[PDB]
Each structure stands twice: as C-alpha cells, then as structure tokens.
Design a protein around this ligand. Structure first.
Ligand SMILES: N=C(N)N1CCCCC1
Lengths: 10, 239
C-alpha cells in the first residue's frame, strides 16, 4: 500500500 | 485521530477494532458494524496480511487496554474486497467482513445506519471521525477511542490539494485548512459519521491523506453512498 494510506505498513 | 478527545461509552457503538494475533496481538484498523454479521472497512487493511484466521474483531470495547485474554471477539468467515480495488491506484477502497457468528445488539454494540444510493452532502454539517490510531504523525495507537469533529470539503477544493491523484465522485473529503484535526495511521477503515436530525449515518470510510492533520491537506474517505448497490448485492448474495 502507498504511503498516503493509513495502515501501519503503508 | 489527531486533535480529538476521549469518547464515552455508547457514543460510537458501531466502532470495531480489527486486530491480528500471530505471536503478538496488535490493533491494525477500524471498521463499522453495519448488520448483525457484517463489518464495513477499507480494502487496504488487507494488503500485506496472512490468511483470515489471524484476525480478532473487537466490538463493544471503548478502551483497548481493557482487553484481556478472556475478552470476547469475533472471527472472520468471509472477506469481500471490492473487485476493482487495486492497491497502487486506491480507488474502491472498501471491503466487507462477514463474522463467524451474528452479534447480539446492545447499547455498546449495534450497527450504524447507511445512506441511500446517490445521496449528497451537504446536508451533512455535523460529521465526526473516530478511531484508536496515532494522535500525531509518528505517534502510537491510543487506548481510549478518540473522536474528532471535522467539516466536509467539496471535491473541487479537495482536488486542488492533491494534484497527483484524481478525487472521484466515489470519494468524500474532510479537514481544516489550518490542519490539526484528522484521522491518522491505525484509523483506516473506521467510520466518518454525520448526525442529521438526531440520527447518525455512515458517510465515509477512512482511506488516505498526506501525513496526518497537515495544513491544506484534507483526509480522503470512501463515499459509502456510492457503494450502496455493491454493499447490498454482496451481503444479500452471501446471506
Ligand atoms: N486522513 C488521513 N490523514 N489519513 C487517513 C487514514 C490513513 C492515514 C492518512
């Protein structure tokens, strides 16, 4: 997942 | 949640904590109870996860530090990720979780109401986002469920802040021009709810944004009304 998303390893 | 406050019991009875246990247990994402055996969350919460036996879904919990080995939790029977969700792209950031057993409804564990297909804010002038995510960028998971009041922003104004990404009609944005109040890491998949005429409804699912609570960078949410045909079809077909 890209950095703009909010899961802990994005 | 950045700039929020501690919630009290029964304010947000649809909020769930989606946790995993491998050798250790940790909160990963939020979600919303929408029916007796259905949670609605973000598709990106399943990126980089093992199979579903790892998940423990907590409902009727206000404070994560109140959780013990004996606290009841739900397990997953089915994960329905939107067919057109693609991780690099990020459109259709929505997923259904079917629980292994239906939950009994209580004051602290009951479903959020859903909008009608093809609905517009405004009308939504009183909107809140909740979760156990970080209280600042590079922060830590919070113990008591946090709440914050955030205004919706038009798609036109949200688009101006995100030149690299297309803000579609299937997204809704919320934030302050001066920043300071926003969802953050660990809030993924949780609710953006708005109170209208006494009743709360689910308007968005927490999805993405640049950092957390930065100035002129609104939070972006999956607009639930634009997926109501999909939610109904998928949950009816499964049930
Ligand atoms: N609204 C913000 N800032 N978010 C949404 C949740 C993932 C982290 C980024």
């Amino acid at each position: 997942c890209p950095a703009r998303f909010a899961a802990l390893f994005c | 949640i950045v700039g929020g406050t501690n919630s009290s019991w029964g304010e947000w009875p649809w909020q769930v904590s989606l946790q995993v246990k491998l050798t250790a247990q940790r909160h990963l994402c939020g979600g919303s109870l929408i029916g007796h055996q259905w949670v609605l969350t973000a598709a990106h919460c399943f990126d980089g996860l093992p199979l579903q036996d790892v998940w423990r879904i907590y409902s009727g919990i206000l404070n994560l530090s109140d959780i013990t080995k004996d606290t009841p939790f739900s397990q997953i029977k089915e994960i329905i990720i939107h067919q057109n969700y693609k991780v690099s792209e990020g459109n259709h950031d929505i997923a259904l979780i079917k629980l292994q057993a239906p939950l009994n409804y209580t004051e602290f564990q009951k479903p959020i109401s859903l909008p009608s297909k093809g609905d517009t804010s405004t009308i939504y002038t009183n909107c809140w986002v909740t979760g156990w995510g970080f209280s600042k960028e590079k922060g830590e998971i919070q113990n008591i469920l946090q709440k914050v009041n955030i205004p919706l922003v038009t798609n036109e104004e949200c688009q101006k802040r995100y030149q690299d990404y297309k803000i579609t009609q299937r997204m809704v944005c919320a934030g302050y021009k001066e920043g300071g109040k926003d969802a953050c890491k660990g809030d993924s998949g949780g609710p953006l709810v708005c109170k209208h005429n006494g009743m709360w409804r689910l308007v968005g699912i927490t999805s993405w944004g640049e950092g957390c609570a930065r100035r002129e960078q609104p939070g972006v949410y999956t607009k639930v009304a634009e997926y109501m045909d999909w939610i109904l079809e998928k949950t009816q077909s499964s049930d």
